[PDB]
Structure 1
Amino acid sequence: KKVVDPFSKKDWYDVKAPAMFNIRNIGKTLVTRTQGTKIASDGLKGRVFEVSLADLQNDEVAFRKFKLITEDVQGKNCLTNFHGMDLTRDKMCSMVKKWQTMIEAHVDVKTTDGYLLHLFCVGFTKKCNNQIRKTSYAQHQQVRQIRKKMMEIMTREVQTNDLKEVVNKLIPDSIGKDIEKACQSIYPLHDVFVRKVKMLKKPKFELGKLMELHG
Protein backbone atom coordinates (compact mmCIF):
# COMPACT_ATOMS: atom_id res chain seq x y z
CA LYS A 1 0.00 0.00 0.00
CA LYS A 2 1.82 3.01 -1.13
CA VAL A 3 4.59 4.04 1.28
CA VAL A 4 7.88 5.63 2.27
CA ASP A 5 10.07 6.01 -0.87
CA PRO A 6 13.36 6.12 0.93
CA PHE A 7 15.80 8.56 -0.69
CA SER A 8 13.35 11.27 0.32
CA LYS A 9 14.55 10.66 3.88
CA LYS A 10 18.25 10.03 3.25
CA ASP A 11 21.22 12.18 4.28
CA TRP A 12 24.61 12.87 2.72
CA TYR A 13 28.17 12.58 4.01
CA ASP A 14 31.49 13.51 2.37
CA VAL A 15 34.01 10.62 2.49
CA LYS A 16 37.41 11.84 3.69
CA ALA A 17 40.74 10.11 2.97
CA PRO A 18 43.81 9.93 5.30
CA ALA A 19 46.68 12.50 4.97
CA MET A 20 49.18 10.61 3.18
CA PHE A 21 47.17 10.57 0.15
CA ASN A 22 46.80 13.61 -2.02
CA ILE A 23 43.69 14.90 -2.78
CA ARG A 24 41.30 13.69 -0.02
CA ASN A 25 37.68 14.26 -1.10
CA ILE A 26 36.67 10.79 -2.16
CA GLY A 27 33.01 11.31 -3.06
CA LYS A 28 29.66 11.14 -1.25
CA THR A 29 27.40 8.53 0.35
CA LEU A 30 23.82 8.36 1.68
CA VAL A 31 22.42 7.05 5.02
CA THR A 32 18.98 7.32 6.65
CA ARG A 33 18.03 10.25 8.81
CA THR A 34 19.12 9.42 12.30
CA GLN A 35 16.14 8.69 14.51
CA GLY A 36 16.50 7.97 18.23
CA THR A 37 15.61 4.54 17.07
CA LYS A 38 18.79 4.71 15.19
CA ILE A 39 22.31 6.08 14.80
CA ALA A 40 22.84 7.18 11.19
CA SER A 41 26.45 7.10 12.28
CA ASP A 42 25.85 3.43 13.13
CA GLY A 43 24.96 2.47 9.55
CA LEU A 44 27.81 4.69 8.47
CA LYS A 45 30.83 3.73 10.63
CA GLY A 46 32.31 0.38 9.44
CA ARG A 47 31.51 1.08 5.76
CA VAL A 48 34.42 0.49 3.41
CA PHE A 49 34.86 2.17 0.04
CA GLU A 50 37.43 0.96 -2.41
CA VAL A 51 39.02 3.78 -4.40
CA SER A 52 41.66 3.65 -7.12
CA LEU A 53 45.07 4.96 -6.09
CA ALA A 54 45.08 6.97 -9.28
CA ASP A 55 42.04 8.98 -8.22
CA LEU A 56 43.79 9.06 -4.83
CA GLN A 57 47.27 10.23 -5.94
CA ASN A 58 46.69 11.39 -9.29
CA ASP A 59 48.29 8.42 -11.28
CA GLU A 60 50.57 5.90 -13.14
CA VAL A 61 48.59 4.24 -10.38
CA ALA A 62 46.01 2.91 -12.79
CA PHE A 63 46.37 -0.50 -11.26
CA ARG A 64 46.47 -0.53 -7.49
CA LYS A 65 43.44 0.05 -5.26
CA PHE A 66 43.06 1.19 -1.64
CA LYS A 67 40.27 0.10 0.68
CA LEU A 68 39.19 3.02 2.87
CA ILE A 69 37.09 2.21 5.94
CA THR A 70 34.98 4.80 7.81
CA GLU A 71 36.37 5.10 11.34
CA ASP A 72 34.35 8.02 12.60
CA VAL A 73 31.79 10.53 11.88
CA GLN A 74 31.70 14.32 12.41
CA GLY A 75 28.72 16.26 10.99
CA LYS A 76 28.58 15.43 7.30
CA ASN A 77 32.23 14.36 7.60
CA CYS A 78 33.52 10.79 7.85
CA LEU A 79 37.12 10.04 8.43
CA THR A 80 38.43 6.89 6.85
CA ASN A 81 41.56 4.79 7.42
CA PHE A 82 43.78 2.42 5.42
CA HIS A 83 42.14 -0.99 5.10
CA GLY A 84 44.00 -2.67 2.24
CA MET A 85 45.65 -2.50 -1.13
CA ASP A 86 44.87 -4.90 -3.95
CA LEU A 87 45.66 -4.78 -7.66
CA THR A 88 42.43 -5.19 -9.65
CA ARG A 89 42.09 -8.05 -12.17
CA ASP A 90 43.28 -6.85 -15.58
CA LYS A 91 46.75 -5.81 -14.32
CA MET A 92 47.39 -9.02 -12.47
CA CYS A 93 46.15 -11.09 -15.37
CA SER A 94 48.44 -9.18 -17.72
CA MET A 95 51.71 -9.93 -15.91
CA VAL A 96 51.11 -13.68 -15.89
CA LYS A 97 52.73 -14.82 -19.14
CA LYS A 98 53.77 -18.29 -20.27
CA TRP A 99 57.42 -19.28 -20.61
CA GLN A 100 58.36 -17.34 -17.46
CA THR A 101 58.42 -18.31 -13.78
CA MET A 102 55.86 -16.72 -11.49
CA ILE A 103 57.25 -16.16 -8.02
CA GLU A 104 55.09 -15.36 -4.97
CA ALA A 105 56.07 -14.72 -1.36
CA HIS A 106 53.88 -13.29 1.39
CA VAL A 107 54.49 -12.55 4.96
CA ASP A 108 52.38 -11.65 7.95
CA VAL A 109 53.85 -9.06 10.27
CA LYS A 110 52.93 -6.69 13.15
CA THR A 111 53.51 -2.98 12.65
CA THR A 112 54.81 -0.39 15.12
CA ASP A 113 51.26 0.64 15.93
CA GLY A 114 49.74 -2.83 16.54
CA TYR A 115 48.19 -3.60 13.27
CA LEU A 116 48.55 -7.11 11.96
CA LEU A 117 49.14 -7.34 8.26
CA HIS A 118 49.52 -10.07 5.69
CA LEU A 119 51.46 -8.54 2.81
CA PHE A 120 52.10 -10.16 -0.56
CA CYS A 121 54.74 -9.74 -3.25
CA VAL A 122 55.13 -11.08 -6.77
CA GLY A 123 57.72 -11.35 -9.52
CA PHE A 124 58.38 -12.99 -12.88
CA THR A 125 61.61 -14.15 -14.47
CA LYS A 126 62.86 -12.11 -17.45
CA LYS A 127 64.63 -13.18 -20.64
CA CYS A 128 67.61 -10.87 -21.12
CA ASN A 129 68.15 -9.47 -24.34
CA ASN A 130 70.74 -11.49 -26.07
CA GLN A 131 69.06 -14.66 -24.78
CA ILE A 132 68.03 -17.04 -27.42
CA ARG A 133 66.26 -19.67 -25.44
CA LYS A 134 62.79 -18.80 -25.91
CA THR A 135 61.57 -19.47 -22.35
CA SER A 136 63.53 -18.12 -19.25
CA TYR A 137 62.55 -20.15 -16.23
CA ALA A 138 64.24 -19.98 -13.00
CA GLN A 139 65.78 -22.95 -11.15
CA HIS A 140 64.20 -24.23 -7.94
CA GLN A 141 67.31 -23.17 -6.03
CA GLN A 142 66.84 -19.64 -7.35
CA VAL A 143 63.19 -19.21 -6.35
CA ARG A 144 63.77 -20.56 -2.85
CA GLN A 145 66.54 -18.01 -2.30
CA ILE A 146 64.62 -15.21 -4.05
CA ARG A 147 61.54 -15.86 -1.91
CA LYS A 148 63.62 -15.72 1.26
CA LYS A 149 64.92 -12.31 0.14
CA MET A 150 61.44 -10.96 -0.63
CA MET A 151 60.18 -12.28 2.74
CA GLU A 152 63.09 -10.86 4.75
CA ILE A 153 62.54 -7.45 3.22
CA MET A 154 58.79 -7.39 3.71
CA THR A 155 59.12 -8.27 7.40
CA ARG A 156 62.08 -5.90 7.74
CA GLU A 157 60.19 -3.13 5.93
CA VAL A 158 56.97 -3.35 7.97
CA GLN A 159 58.18 -4.23 11.46
CA THR A 160 59.78 -0.81 11.74
CA ASN A 161 57.10 1.78 10.82
CA ASP A 162 53.33 2.31 11.36
CA LEU A 163 50.35 1.85 9.01
CA LYS A 164 51.08 5.35 7.67
CA GLU A 165 54.71 4.73 6.62
CA VAL A 166 53.81 1.48 4.98
CA VAL A 167 51.33 3.66 3.12
CA ASN A 168 53.95 6.41 2.46
CA LYS A 169 56.18 3.52 1.33
CA LEU A 170 53.73 1.72 -1.00
CA ILE A 171 53.00 4.90 -2.97
CA PRO A 172 56.47 5.51 -4.51
CA ASP A 173 56.85 1.74 -4.56
CA SER A 174 60.20 1.73 -2.66
CA ILE A 175 59.80 -1.89 -1.68
CA GLY A 176 59.58 -2.89 -5.34
CA LYS A 177 62.90 -1.24 -6.09
CA ASP A 178 64.50 -2.64 -2.97
CA ILE A 179 63.52 -6.19 -3.98
CA GLU A 180 64.93 -5.49 -7.40
CA LYS A 181 68.25 -4.60 -5.82
CA ALA A 182 68.44 -7.58 -3.51
CA CYS A 183 67.44 -10.04 -6.26
CA GLN A 184 69.28 -9.18 -9.50
CA SER A 185 72.37 -10.81 -8.01
CA ILE A 186 70.38 -14.08 -8.08
CA TYR A 187 68.22 -14.00 -11.23
CA PRO A 188 66.76 -11.42 -13.69
CA LEU A 189 63.06 -10.62 -12.78
CA HIS A 190 60.63 -8.33 -14.63
CA ASP A 191 57.63 -6.90 -12.81
CA VAL A 192 57.82 -7.07 -8.99
CA PHE A 193 55.32 -5.52 -6.71
CA VAL A 194 53.91 -5.85 -3.32
CA ARG A 195 50.58 -6.72 -4.87
CA LYS A 196 48.26 -6.94 -1.90
CA VAL A 197 48.03 -5.99 1.75
CA LYS A 198 45.51 -7.54 4.14
CA MET A 199 44.50 -6.07 7.48
CA LEU A 200 44.30 -8.99 9.91
CA LYS A 201 44.02 -7.52 13.44
CA LYS A 202 43.14 -3.94 14.42
CA PRO A 203 44.57 -2.28 17.55
CA LYS A 204 42.13 -0.67 19.94
CA PHE A 205 40.47 2.43 18.81
CA GLU A 206 42.37 5.55 19.66
CA LEU A 207 40.88 8.61 17.99
CA GLY A 208 44.25 10.27 18.56
CA LYS A 209 46.17 8.68 15.69
CA LEU A 210 43.11 8.75 13.43
CA MET A 211 42.86 12.54 13.80
CA GLU A 212 46.67 12.99 13.51
CA LEU A 213 46.19 11.32 10.17
CA HIS A 214 43.06 13.21 9.28
CA GLY A 215 42.33 16.73 10.49
Structure 2
Amino acid sequence: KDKWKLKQWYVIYAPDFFGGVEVGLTPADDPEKVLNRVVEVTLKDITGDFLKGHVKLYFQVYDVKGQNAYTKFKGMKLARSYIRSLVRRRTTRIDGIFNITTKDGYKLRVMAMVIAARRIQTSQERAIRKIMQEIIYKKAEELNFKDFVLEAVNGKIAAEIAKEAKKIYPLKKAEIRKIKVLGEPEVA
Protein backbone atom coordinates (compact mmCIF):
# COMPACT_ATOMS: atom_id res chain seq x y z
CA LYS A 1 0.00 0.00 0.00
CA ASP A 2 1.10 3.55 -0.78
CA LYS A 3 0.66 4.71 2.83
CA TRP A 4 3.20 2.04 3.51
CA LYS A 5 4.89 2.38 0.14
CA LEU A 6 5.45 6.11 0.39
CA LYS A 7 7.71 5.82 3.42
CA GLN A 8 11.40 6.60 3.27
CA TRP A 9 14.32 4.98 5.01
CA TYR A 10 16.19 7.38 7.26
CA VAL A 11 19.27 6.26 9.16
CA ILE A 12 20.33 6.96 12.71
CA TYR A 13 23.74 7.63 14.17
CA ALA A 14 25.32 6.90 17.47
CA PRO A 15 25.72 10.21 19.27
CA ASP A 16 28.95 12.02 18.76
CA PHE A 17 30.65 11.26 22.07
CA PHE A 18 30.33 7.55 21.53
CA GLY A 19 31.93 8.05 18.16
CA GLY A 20 29.49 8.03 15.29
CA VAL A 21 28.59 4.44 14.55
CA GLU A 22 25.45 3.80 12.52
CA VAL A 23 22.59 1.95 14.19
CA GLY A 24 19.14 1.03 12.91
CA LEU A 25 16.84 1.91 10.02
CA THR A 26 13.70 3.93 10.39
CA PRO A 27 10.92 4.58 7.86
CA ALA A 28 9.27 7.98 7.59
CA ASP A 29 7.85 10.38 5.01
CA ASP A 30 8.56 14.02 5.86
CA PRO A 31 11.41 15.30 8.01
CA GLU A 32 9.15 17.20 10.40
CA LYS A 33 7.82 13.98 11.95
CA VAL A 34 10.82 11.90 13.03
CA LEU A 35 12.30 14.30 15.50
CA ASN A 36 10.99 12.96 18.79
CA ARG A 37 11.32 9.21 18.54
CA VAL A 38 13.79 7.41 20.77
CA VAL A 39 16.09 4.44 20.39
CA GLU A 40 17.28 1.62 22.58
CA VAL A 41 20.36 -0.45 21.84
CA THR A 42 22.89 -2.30 23.93
CA LEU A 43 26.44 -1.35 24.64
CA LYS A 44 27.78 -4.42 22.88
CA ASP A 45 26.47 -3.21 19.47
CA ILE A 46 28.27 0.11 19.72
CA THR A 47 31.92 -0.88 20.10
CA GLY A 48 30.99 -3.35 22.79
CA ASP A 49 32.95 -6.28 24.22
CA PHE A 50 30.54 -9.03 25.18
CA LEU A 51 30.70 -8.99 28.98
CA LYS A 52 29.00 -5.61 28.87
CA GLY A 53 26.00 -7.31 27.41
CA HIS A 54 23.63 -6.45 30.23
CA VAL A 55 23.93 -2.65 29.86
CA LYS A 56 21.21 -0.87 27.95
CA LEU A 57 21.24 2.62 26.49
CA TYR A 58 19.01 5.31 25.01
CA PHE A 59 19.44 8.09 22.49
CA GLN A 60 16.88 10.56 21.21
CA VAL A 61 17.28 12.17 17.83
CA TYR A 62 17.50 15.92 17.52
CA ASP A 63 18.02 16.69 13.82
CA VAL A 64 17.26 15.53 10.28
CA LYS A 65 19.89 16.48 7.68
CA GLY A 66 19.23 14.51 4.53
CA GLN A 67 18.86 10.90 5.68
CA ASN A 68 20.78 11.41 8.91
CA ALA A 69 19.42 11.67 12.40
CA TYR A 70 22.34 12.60 14.63
CA THR A 71 21.33 11.44 18.03
CA LYS A 72 21.55 12.86 21.50
CA PHE A 73 21.95 11.01 24.76
CA LYS A 74 18.87 10.46 26.81
CA GLY A 75 19.45 7.84 29.49
CA MET A 76 20.71 4.43 30.51
CA LYS A 77 19.20 1.29 32.02
CA LEU A 78 20.41 -2.06 33.37
CA ALA A 79 18.90 -5.50 32.86
CA ARG A 80 16.15 -6.44 35.29
CA SER A 81 16.79 -10.16 35.13
CA TYR A 82 20.45 -9.38 35.76
CA ILE A 83 20.03 -7.56 39.07
CA ARG A 84 17.34 -10.08 39.93
CA SER A 85 20.22 -12.54 39.95
CA LEU A 86 21.96 -10.64 42.72
CA VAL A 87 19.44 -9.94 45.50
CA ARG A 88 19.00 -13.29 47.21
CA ARG A 89 18.33 -14.17 50.83
CA ARG A 90 20.80 -12.89 53.42
CA THR A 91 22.05 -10.09 51.14
CA THR A 92 20.50 -6.73 52.17
CA ARG A 93 20.65 -4.48 49.13
CA ILE A 94 21.52 -0.82 49.46
CA ASP A 95 19.75 1.88 47.49
CA GLY A 96 20.88 5.37 46.62
CA ILE A 97 19.03 8.05 44.69
CA PHE A 98 20.61 11.39 44.00
CA ASN A 99 20.32 14.66 42.15
CA ILE A 100 23.45 16.27 40.73
CA THR A 101 24.24 18.88 38.10
CA THR A 102 27.15 19.30 35.76
CA LYS A 103 29.73 21.98 34.99
CA ASP A 104 28.11 22.69 31.64
CA GLY A 105 24.80 22.81 33.46
CA TYR A 106 23.08 19.55 32.69
CA LYS A 107 21.32 18.36 35.83
CA LEU A 108 20.56 14.69 36.22
CA ARG A 109 19.09 12.06 38.53
CA VAL A 110 20.95 8.81 39.21
CA MET A 111 20.07 5.70 41.23
CA ALA A 112 23.10 3.63 42.26
CA MET A 113 23.02 0.42 44.31
CA VAL A 114 25.33 -1.71 46.43
CA ILE A 115 24.92 -5.20 47.88
CA ALA A 116 26.63 -6.33 51.07
CA ALA A 117 27.68 -9.90 51.80
CA ARG A 118 25.40 -10.55 54.77
CA ARG A 119 22.83 -8.76 56.86
CA ILE A 120 23.81 -5.59 58.70
CA GLN A 121 21.99 -3.15 60.90
CA THR A 122 21.42 0.34 59.58
CA SER A 123 24.04 2.07 61.70
CA GLN A 124 26.51 0.17 59.62
CA GLU A 125 24.35 0.74 56.57
CA ARG A 126 23.40 4.40 56.28
CA ALA A 127 27.06 5.32 56.55
CA ILE A 128 27.64 3.55 53.26
CA ARG A 129 24.92 5.66 51.73
CA LYS A 130 26.41 8.87 53.05
CA ILE A 131 29.77 7.79 51.67
CA MET A 132 28.34 7.18 48.21
CA GLN A 133 26.65 10.55 48.04
CA GLU A 134 29.84 12.20 49.17
CA ILE A 135 32.17 10.54 46.68
CA ILE A 136 29.76 11.33 43.90
CA TYR A 137 29.18 15.00 44.73
CA LYS A 138 32.86 15.76 44.49
CA LYS A 139 33.02 13.80 41.28
CA ALA A 140 30.30 15.70 39.42
CA GLU A 141 31.87 19.15 39.75
CA GLU A 142 34.89 18.79 37.47
CA LEU A 143 33.45 16.95 34.50
CA ASN A 144 31.53 18.01 31.42
CA PHE A 145 28.22 16.35 30.78
CA LYS A 146 29.23 14.13 27.88
CA ASP A 147 32.28 12.91 29.75
CA PHE A 148 30.39 12.16 32.94
CA VAL A 149 28.04 9.80 31.12
CA LEU A 150 31.14 8.37 29.46
CA GLU A 151 32.90 6.94 32.48
CA ALA A 152 30.05 5.87 34.74
CA VAL A 153 28.64 3.64 32.00
CA ASN A 154 32.15 2.72 30.98
CA GLY A 155 32.18 1.00 34.37
CA LYS A 156 34.57 3.28 36.23
CA ILE A 157 32.85 4.88 39.24
CA ALA A 158 32.00 1.39 40.46
CA ALA A 159 35.70 0.78 41.06
CA GLU A 160 35.71 3.65 43.52
CA ILE A 161 32.58 3.16 45.58
CA ALA A 162 33.68 -0.48 45.69
CA LYS A 163 36.87 0.98 47.14
CA GLU A 164 35.89 3.55 49.75
CA ALA A 165 32.84 1.61 50.91
CA LYS A 166 34.80 -1.54 51.54
CA LYS A 167 36.51 0.52 54.24
CA ILE A 168 33.42 -0.18 56.34
CA TYR A 169 32.42 -3.71 55.42
CA PRO A 170 33.17 -6.27 52.67
CA LEU A 171 30.75 -6.31 49.75
CA LYS A 172 30.13 -7.42 46.18
CA LYS A 173 29.04 -5.78 42.93
CA ALA A 174 29.06 -2.07 43.65
CA GLU A 175 27.93 -0.04 40.66
CA ILE A 176 25.49 2.46 39.16
CA ARG A 177 22.25 1.30 37.59
CA LYS A 178 19.93 3.80 35.96
CA ILE A 179 20.46 7.31 34.69
CA LYS A 180 17.70 9.71 33.62
CA VAL A 181 18.12 13.28 32.35
CA LEU A 182 16.08 16.19 33.66
CA GLY A 183 16.59 19.22 31.46
CA GLU A 184 19.22 21.00 29.44
CA PRO A 185 20.96 24.22 30.26
CA GLU A 186 20.41 27.71 28.99
CA VAL A 187 23.96 28.37 27.79
CA ALA A 188 25.11 27.21 24.34
Out of 148, 152, 158, the position equivalent to 1:166 is 148
Return the offset for 1:64: 1.2
Q: How many residues align?
A: 187
Return the offset for 1:77: 0.5
Q: Give 5+ residue unaligned stretches, structure 1.
A: 35-39, 127-135, 207-215
Out of 93, 108, 127, the position equivalent to 2:99 is 108
Whichever residue aligns with residue 36 of structure 2, its letter is: G
Q: Deviations over 1:98-155 (max 9, x none)?
A: 11110011211111222110011111112xxxxxxxxx11221121110011111222
Superposition pairs for residues 21-40 of structure 1, below 5 Å? 21=18, 24-32=21-29, 34=30, 40=31
- Any conservation in 2 of the 1:138–1:187 contact (CA below 8 Å)? no
Superposition pairs for residues 25-174 of structure 1, below 5 Å? 25-32=22-29, 34=30, 40=31, 42-59=32-49, 60-126=51-117, 136-174=118-156
Return the offset for 1:22: 5.2
Q: Percent identity?
A: 32
Matched, 1:6 2:8: no
Q: Give 5+ residue unaligned stretches, structure 2.
A: none
Partners of 1:85 and 1:202 lie apart in 2 by 17
Q: Deviations over 1:78-117 (max 9, x none)?
A: 1111100110221121121111110011211111222110
Q: Pick closer, same or farther for the CA change 1:205–1:49 going to 2, 3 Å.
A: farther
Out of 157, 160, 164, the position equivalent to 1:175 is 157
Q: TM-score, normalised by structure 1?
A: 0.81
The structure with the largest alpha-carbon Rg is 1
Whichever residue aligns with residue 127 of structure 2, its letter is: Q
CA RMSD of aligned residues (A): 1.7
Instruction: Report SS of the residue matched to 2:28.
Output: strand
Instruction: Report SS of the residue matched to 2:105.
Output: coil
